[PDB]
Amino acid sequence: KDQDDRDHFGKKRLDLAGPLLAQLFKTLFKKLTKDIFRYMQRTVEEAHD
Amino acid sequence: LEPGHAADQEQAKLIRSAIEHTTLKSVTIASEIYYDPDPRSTVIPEDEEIIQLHFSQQSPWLLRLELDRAAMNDKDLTMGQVGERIKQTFKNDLFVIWSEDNDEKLIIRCRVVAEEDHMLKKIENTMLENITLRGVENIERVVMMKYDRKVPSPTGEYVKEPEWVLETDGVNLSEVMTVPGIDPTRIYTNSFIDIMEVLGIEAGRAALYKEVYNVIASDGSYVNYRHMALLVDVMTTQGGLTSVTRHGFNRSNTGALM
Amino acid sequence: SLMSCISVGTDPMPIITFLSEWGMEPLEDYVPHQSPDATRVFVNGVWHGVHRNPARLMETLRTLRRKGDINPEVSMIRDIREKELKIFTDAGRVYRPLFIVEDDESLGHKELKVRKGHIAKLMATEYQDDVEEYTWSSLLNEGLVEYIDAEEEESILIAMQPEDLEPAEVDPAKRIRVSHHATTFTHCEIHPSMILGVAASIIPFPDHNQSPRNTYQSAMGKQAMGVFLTN
Amino acid sequence: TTFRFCRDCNNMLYPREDKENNRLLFECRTCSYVEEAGSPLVYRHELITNIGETAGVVQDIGSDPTLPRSDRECPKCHSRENVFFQSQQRRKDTSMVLFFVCLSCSHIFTSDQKNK
Amino acid sequence: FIKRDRMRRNFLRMREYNEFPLRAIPKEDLENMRTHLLKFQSKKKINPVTDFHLPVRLHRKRKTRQLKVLDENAKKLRFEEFYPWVMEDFYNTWVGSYEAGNSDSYVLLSVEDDGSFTMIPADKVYKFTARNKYATXXXXXXXXXXXX
Amino acid sequence: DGPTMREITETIAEAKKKVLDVTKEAQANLLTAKHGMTLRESFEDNVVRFLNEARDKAGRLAEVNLKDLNNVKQMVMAGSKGSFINIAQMSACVGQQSVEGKRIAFGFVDRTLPHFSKDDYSPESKGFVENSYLRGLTPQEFFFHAMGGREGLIDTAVKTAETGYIQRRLVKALEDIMVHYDNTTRNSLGNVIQFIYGEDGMDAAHIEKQSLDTIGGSDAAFEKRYRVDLLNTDHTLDPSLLESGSEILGDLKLQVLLDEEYKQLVKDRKFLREVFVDGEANWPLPVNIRRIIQNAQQTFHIDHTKPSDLTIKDIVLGVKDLQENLLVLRGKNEIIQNAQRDAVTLFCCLLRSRLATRRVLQEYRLTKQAFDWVLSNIEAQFLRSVVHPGEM
Amino acid sequence: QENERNISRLWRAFRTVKEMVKDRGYFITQEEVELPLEDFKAKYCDSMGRPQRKMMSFQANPTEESISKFPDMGSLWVEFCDEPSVGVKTMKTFVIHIQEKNFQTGIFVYQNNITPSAMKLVPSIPPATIETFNEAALVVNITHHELVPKHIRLSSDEKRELLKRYRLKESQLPRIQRADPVALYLGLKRGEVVKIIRKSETSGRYASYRICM
Ligand SMILES: [Zn+2]
Ligand SMILES: [Zn+2]
């Protein structure tokens, strides 16, 4: 068998707004959850409302 | 080639057969290993003929191989001179037998004074790769070319006289120069570096000029002799060959600013 | 190109669930000595198992793929020499619509699936807009046009002009074309002029013009003066 | 070259020289399973490889639409309906000798007129 | 040779057998015992448990306020039972492992004395492997022997 | 025309039959490749050679069919715009579209496009465009032509991007090099690159391609031209050439001078045989003698059948006195005069070749004022062809 | 077989040695260099057929013109070696022999290689020098090639005259490396200016001046 061709257009995937906003909204959502939990730990640790 | 042996194909075939690298693997169709404990007698019914002839304490393991007759033709070889080469390679530790050219099947067998198989397999690598049957190193695919050569006639004007000239793939200038059967006073290399090393600085200069001039004439353009001469000279005025780089004139004094 | 689109991705679970109902042996039960001629099944590169009858299974998946059950964006390839059957339903693939050619017809030779009646109903709905609700989706669900990416394009034979390469058999001003020795035409090109992009589509008679001039004009077409909108 | 495996151990059988009876044997170094030798051959390298040119021949090769069609008859069944394709062994020095595959008896007859 | 743009007017102007019953065993026996499957990996065809001899034994071998990650149920119950069982005598060894994928749909048709059959749903399935046939090993001796 | 279109169709058709025959002989394994290449390389060279031969022949037929009333023929014959390849691709056939110097490779499984069969080695499917730009192109040909166009653009872009870097390395490589007021090329630090600029001391704005009459011609022509005998009848002097030809014959001194000139020309011929071993006589040199001779003949009204008033000592001693007037170096030491003679040897050989007694008395028929004017023009133009010191 | 070929290579190499010594300025006649192969085999080969390189060692005497131009130029002693690997003791015999015979220069030709201790024991007797050349390297004379112009070793007075007429320092001349097979062919030293006469295609005869490193 010949060496696997990488220039075959079928083996290539395009990215529109869907995948890009999926990565972006994914990371931003993770940061949001982490920050919310940080506020929770600060609240229960500092003993406040 | 030499002017005396010009326009000759057989002589150029001898020169090609004297410099073109050849190896034992080139001629080898296949090889196979056999267990044959008795040194003289062979279980194989065919090779018995060889056993009958080439005979008239040693390893029980047999190494055997077969050669392409076409390879024995295209690259002129003799089963005899091959066996000579191996015998003078490993000397006496490896006993050797080889079939005749008359045999429709070319056969070669060898033995030695843990398991013997691994030892044989090592020797197989040495046989295929490390044996060169003929020719000097780094020479391949010698092409015969009929090149017309302008030479003066005794009638006062030049005449084109075709002669066989050997084009060569790969390079090894020093070894090729010493071989008898060619002009040692004529030879060229597309790599001007080798010309510099072997034939010295002046030859390196002229060769460099030829290399530059070649690309110019290939482009289909004309450039005056003055400019190319100046360029070539600059690259050679400190001895040897000097690169045109930022490591080729910024590593020698010219003023810190320059 | 003018008819090229990008896939969006579907769900491979219903397909994997549907394969095991027809005897698709799982991978962990595979023995190469008991079933050497089994065809491996691949779903998005994941090897789920093999099957000892890829013909009827492939025909079933194709018939159910043309009826509109499976999303047409999914591209399935069946490599014979490699003895594989790749299934791609991931987002990012670029496909293009092409017609479907059938060999079994009442005329005795091969012919397209779409006929003149479907064209008559289609144009009736187009010029009517009484209506018959016959659009592109109705042409797709009846198995008359199919999307093909660059992976499935490896295992299909496409014809350029319909009425020039499908039927079986000259003025010197026309161009010389190929022959129709090939019989196994599976698909047919809608129109070759669709291979060009938007900028090259403005070029008049680009066949009679050299390519770099088509490129230069395609570059100058992105900066000419005009009217972009009315507002 | 076409070696056997051990019983229970299923490991490869390394060759063992029998110095007592002076004969080849096949052993398993994990256990004490040693069987006799039915052949003195052990290793064959075979440098110039000619196999693999006709690789990937399947029973369903006649239903491939991408493959061409020819009108040459088979030397066996004399069927002019066949499918031809070149060698499957991909290499620089691979010849372009066609391989005829009849669509009746599934015989593979080539088109080489020099060597058959 | 010209673009036909008057298609609106053209379209406007043109348009022997043996029957045996099946039964479901009462769920009391299913609540008492769980049915698992056995599959050997020694290639030998026979290998019955009678030839496995006796006695056959199959047995299983300060910080402030912080953060936890999470986990679910069935996966946790299968993760806590990470001790595989073994069957031996007092010598042959068989050590089994989970199969997981071969759960799905597996119904047992146990044949009794009569022609009827008793169907039992399979809980799990395990692959038993004959262990310690040759009897050898080394650890650090093999780590130093592999450095040659 | 019609018949020309049919001749092009048959020309391409014969090449198609040749590619089909070589294709069948290659599929039958009946063709052995030559040394250095394999079967596929020789086959592709044969197919490409036949296709380019048919395209060139069709282009020749399309070029011959056109008349002189066509404007493209007037533009091609004018040398402004247009060429033979343009009308060969527009009127006859485009040709073979090659990528990276090779045929259209298989972008798919054993085929170039998914519109052909597998293992197809026909020239049409491998990239041959048998249609012309007058009748349009097919899609499978327009695609390959687009590949060739994009490849041309990319290649030109890379050649320019590297050409700039090469240009900067050459400019910054050769910068502080000039010629001082001593006719010696040396840089700013005093390192001597060339003792004489261009190894001759001549600017590149006054050099013209000249022909060497010393090596040109056969031995019988050499002895027939450069031998003017006075006491022998082999190469005697025609007395009707000059006015005093009846008194020149029988002179021993002028015959000795002719012997010295002839021996000098023979030594110059051996020297040119050792310098130029290729046999070419055309080399760039300063001072155009032919224009000076023609200006002298058209200035002094020198026509044929006119006896000249020159003698042998006037031409011989005139050339010998002109050879000392050629000066490039203004020194007087040993090495300076050695470099001057070694830098003027070739030009002196050219002047001794073009300024022979037979060539002036027989062909040119120059007089006294015409010959002296030619000498003054040669010395003058030689003094103007000197490179100026201080030029970069 | 191999013996006759080795005799031929040793004969061409010996002819190259005579040509090299003759180019240095020593008195060797033309008929002495143009000696055929059959005479060389009839002189320096035993009855068995093997050549004797110990008998091929000879002495070179400078010409009258070389003494007139270079008054400090002395005689030369040329020796070979029958050993494949030249030991240190043979080199000691060569150096001590040169010191006894009182030669200004010396040339020693080896077959394969020499021990590093011998190469270190070369600059031991100033101002005398020893030139170590290989038998396989002197098979072909490099000066008979077309791409190699003519080289002439100048003197001290001509060097000072050149630098005085051209107004140059020794560093301003084009430098040539000692490792040049041409510099080793002529046996050049530090501070020696050589003249290169080359046949240009724009002037016929171009001259150059180089100086060793
Ligand atoms: Zn075992
Ligand atoms: Zn058949």
Of F28, F40, F109, the CB nearest to D111: F28
Sequence length of chain E is 148
Tell me which residue of B119, F347, C75 sits closest to A9, measured CA to CA. C75
C100 contacts C143 by C-beta, under 8 angstroms? yes
Alpha carbons B190 and G137: distance in angstroms, whole number = 22
Residues D84, D89, D91, D95, CA torsion sign: negative
Residue with tokens 């060169």: B132
DSSP-assigned letters across all residues of F260-323: HHHHHHHHHHHHHHHH--S---EEEEES-HHHHHHHHHHHTT--SS--B---HHHHHHHHHHHH
Alpha carbons E136 and E145: distance in angstroms, whole number = 14
Q: What secondary structure letter does DSSP report for E66?
A: -
The whole-angstrom distance between D96's CA and the closest CA on chain F is 5
Residues B190, B196, B198, B200, CA torsion sign: positive
DSSP-assigned letters across all residues of D49-63: --TTTT----GGGGG
SS3 G6: helix
Tell me which residue of F176, F199, F282, F206 sits closest to B225, measured CA to CA. F199
SS3 G132: strand
Strand partners for G197: G150, G207
- Residue in B25, B28, B29, B32 to test binding to D, most D beta-carbons within 10 Å: B32
Strand partners for B144: B166
SS3 C179: coil
Angle, CA B66 vertex, CA B60 and CA B72 arms, to 5°: 140
**DSSP strand E in F85-131: where?**
95-96, 128-129
What experimental approach yielded this model?
cryo-EM
G182/B200 Cβ within 8 A: yes
DSSP-assigned letters across all residues of B74-125: HTT--HHHHHHHHHHHHGGGEEEEE--SSSSSEEEEEEE---HHHHHHHHHH
Q: Which ligand is nearest to the CA of E133?
A: 1
Contacts of residue E48, defined as CB under 8 A and 6 or more positions apart, other chains included, come to none
Identify the structural domains of chain D with CATH numbers, from first to last. 1-45 (2.20.25.10), 46-116 (2.20.25.10)
Of F115, F138, F149, the CB nearest to C211: F149
Contacts of residue C200, defined as CB under 8 A and 6 or more positions apart, other chains included, come to C206, C214, C217, C218
Alpha carbons E83 and E95: distance in angstroms, whole number = 11
Contacts of residue C150, defined as CB under 8 A and 6 or more positions apart, other chains included, come to A8, A9, A10, C93, C94
Tell me which residue of C111, C136, C128 sits closest to C3, measured CA to CA. C136
Q: Which ligand is nearest to the CA of D80?
A: 2
> What tokens were used for F113?
């496009």
Closest residue of B to D14, CA-based? Answer: B115
Long-range pairs of F371-374 with CB within 8 A, sequence gap ≥ 24: F371/F296, F371/F310, F371/F314, F371/F315, F371/F318, F372/F318, F373/F296, F373/F299, F373/F300, F374/F292, F374/F293, F374/F296
SS3 F165: helix
Other beta carbons within 10 angstroms of residue E73's beta carbon come to 7
Residues E129, E133, E134, E136, CA torsion sign: positive
Other beta carbons within 10 angstroms of residue F214's beta carbon come to 22
Residue with tokens 């040793």: G10
Strand partners for G130: G106
Alpha carbons B181 and F112: distance in angstroms, whole number = 50
Other beta carbons within 10 angstroms of residue B24's beta carbon come to 22
Query: Is D113 annotated as ligand-binding?
Result: no
- Residue in A5, A13, A15, A20 to test binding to C, most C beta-carbons within 10 Å: A13
Q: What secondary structure letter does DSSP report for F133?
A: T
Sequence length of chain B is 258
List chain D residues with CB under 8 Å of F43. Answer: 96
Half-sphere exposure of C41 (CA within 13 A, CB side): 24
D90 contacts A1 by C-beta, under 8 angstroms? yes
List chain G residues with CB under 8 Å of B203. Answer: 145, 147-148
Q: What secondary structure letter does DSSP report for D5?
A: B
Alpha carbons G39 and B195: distance in angstroms, whole number = 35
Tell me which residue of D24, D51, D21, D4 sits closest to B33, measured CA to CA. D24
Given the candidates 1.10.357.10, 1.10.8.50, 1.10.132.30, 1.10.1040.20, the CATH classification of the domain at F1-138 is: 1.10.132.30
Q: Which ligand is nearest to the CA of D26?
A: 1
In one letter, which amino acid is G13? A
Kindly provide the b/e burial profile for residues E120-137, where b requires at least 16 CB atoms within 10 angstroms of the residue's own CB. bebeebbbbebeeeeeee
Sequence length of chain G is 213
> Separation of D78 CA from ligand 2 center, angstroms?
6
F196 contacts F184 by C-beta, under 8 angstroms? yes
Alpha carbons D83 and C26: distance in angstroms, whole number = 34
Tell me which residue of D46, D86, D83, D45 sits closest to D65, measured CA to CA. D83
Query: Residues of F near C (CB-CB distance < 8 A)?
Result: 2, 5, 108-109, 114-117, 124, 130-131, 133-140, 142-143, 145-146, 148-150, 152-153
> Separation of D66 CA from ligand 2 center, angstroms?
20
Half-sphere exposure of G115 (CA within 13 A, CB side): 12
Q: What secondary structure letter does DSSP report for E134?
A: S
* Ion ligand 2 neighbours, Cβ < 5 Å: D 74, 76-77, 79, 102, 104-105, 107
Alpha carbons C96 and F324: distance in angstroms, whole number = 86
B63 contacts B86 by C-beta, under 8 angstroms? no
Number of A–E residue contacts, CB under 8 Å: 7
> What tokens were used for G15?
């002819």
> What tokens were used for B91?
């000397």
Q: Do chains G and D touch (3 or more CB pairs under 8 A)?
A: no
Q: How far apart are the first and last CA of chain C?
A: 29
- Residue in D17, D48, D115 to test binding to B, most B beta-carbons within 10 Å: D17
Alpha carbons F89 and F67: distance in angstroms, whole number = 17
B233/F193 Cβ within 8 A: yes
Please report all neighbours of F, defined by 3+ CB atom pairs within 8 A: B, C, D, G
List chain F residues with CB under 8 Å of D96. Answer: 26-27, 29, 39-40, 43, 121
Tell me which residue of C186, D68, C177, D60 sits closest to F119, measured CA to CA. D68
Q: Do chains G and A touch (3 or more CB pairs under 8 A)?
A: no
Query: Is D92 annotated as ligand-binding?
Result: no
Q: At what angle do helices B192-199 and B201-218 cross, to 10 degrees?
A: 160
The whole-angstrom distance between C127's CA and the closest CA on chain F is 32
Query: Is D31 annotated as ligand-binding?
Result: yes
Identify the structural domains of chain G with CATH numbers, from first to last. 1-140 (3.40.1340.10), 141-213 (3.90.940.20)
E12/C28 Cβ within 8 A: no
Rounded to an integer, what is the distance from CA F103 to the centroid of its chain?
34
> What tokens were used for E100?
């997981």
> Separation of D5 CA from ligand 1 center, angstroms?
8
Query: Is D3 annotated as ligand-binding?
Result: no
Q: What is the phi/psi pair of residue C174, to 5°? A: -80, 160
